[PDB]
């Protein structure tokens, strides 16, 4: 039972850690805002239509 | 003119019937590795 609890603590440590790691979702979203502004290209395209 | 000692009997034998505490201890481990695998997939 002490061994099992030690294994559980080790795995919860790893779990929190990987959760933090995924929390990459920020670099993705921030850059998606960046490229969203870049696609807002649309301004140039409208001007070409005129 | 007498003295005695005493010996305890530990009992708590519901736990002792099994290893000791396995209700929310060994099951927690069981489902916690599952959390680990699913999180590994989520981060992947």
Curated annotation (Swiss-Prot), chain A:
Residues of the t-SNARE coiled-coil homology domain: 2-50
Role played: Component of a SNARE complex that may be the effector of SEC4 function in exocytosis.
Subunit structure: Interacts with SRO7 and SRO77.
The family this protein is said to belong to: Belongs to the SNAP-25 family.
Protein name: Protein transport protein SEC9
Species of provenance: Saccharomyces cerevisiae (strain ATCC 204508 / S288c)
Taxon lineage: Eukaryota, Fungi, Dikarya, Ascomycota, Saccharomycotina
Gene name linked to the record: SEC9
Stretch of the intact protein here: 433 to 484 of 651
Swiss-Prot record, chain B:
Coiled-coil regions listed in the entry: none
Domain of life assignment: Eukaryota
Subcellular compartments: Membrane
Family in the record: Belongs to the syntaxin family.
Function: Required for vesicle fusion with the plasma membrane.
Miscellaneous notes: Present with 450 molecules/cell in log phase SD medium.
Protein name as catalogued: Protein SSO1
